[PDB]
Amino acid sequence: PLKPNFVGRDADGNVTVDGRSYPMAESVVATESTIHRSMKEMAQTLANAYKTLKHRDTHNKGNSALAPITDENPLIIISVLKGSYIFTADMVRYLGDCGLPNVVDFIRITQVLDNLRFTELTGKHVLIMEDIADTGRTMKLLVEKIRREYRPASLKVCVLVDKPGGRVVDFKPEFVCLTAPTRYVVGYGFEVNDRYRNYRHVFVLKPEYAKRYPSKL
Template structure:
């Protein structure tokens, strides 16, 4: 799967780029959470690939859990309505929680999720996002502590990111051709 998929307009981040980004984030998180009771929470489904790689680069004790939230009506734009589809299996009270996200654009869904989790009284609550979209003229509702890299405000897929449940398995992040989702 080294060749570019025919639905991809261009590759933004190669497999090697991704490995370097994840390694850097893992080193930062290791340093910041050494000796703490860290829980990584992946927001399903997109973040599962990133979290799988990230947790293997973190050299301190950590637990993992998963949440699934729904906020996308047609798959391209947020509906503004958030609902929890799958909640945590563990209690996070008094623990250091790091939400692991694949991509951050408006941050509205993540803001809702953070409010929900903060009501469960973790010792700390932060966000690590692989991609932070550069959306002109718009401020983000959440300020992540860890940012892998910025990306243009385009429809990106690969490395866990999808369109209609396709392209998650691409080993790179690329821009989807507009004719695919128009």
């Protein structure tokens, strides 16, 4: 079954989740009970969409035929630092429960700042793991740049939260765990100067906290 987290308020009037007060929160999008089931349900959504596929063999590269998605040629996951590292670590653990083998590497953007260590993505099935898509501009360009220089057999994006109301361009992620309002959310990887990243639930931040920590780290 599902043991969901209760959302209420304290005597001070702060948003609480199972007793712990959250003065930063204005609303609660999804709690860890709701967030986590969006993943084991999508881990199978990803498992159903990648397990029959066949891409370029690299175990025995002296092979002109496409090998399936095995441990010898696993699906390539590119996680977008710094926000999706919690979302990814929970995700790839779920993909193992569903039996889809994968290998993960990271990318830091603001347009590459820190770069992949993977080299053979040509003719492969690749999967970007991002925390959220708001305007769409960050992931619209990132898949252009990956698809351009690497030319994979497939490059689709999987994000946890998706607010389709803030889109300046056309970016529609192929796999979405949660759809949130057009608001700035904090928690489960979402930050305000790296604060509130380690909160287990995704809350809508009180606008009064917008620039609460202006000092550079």
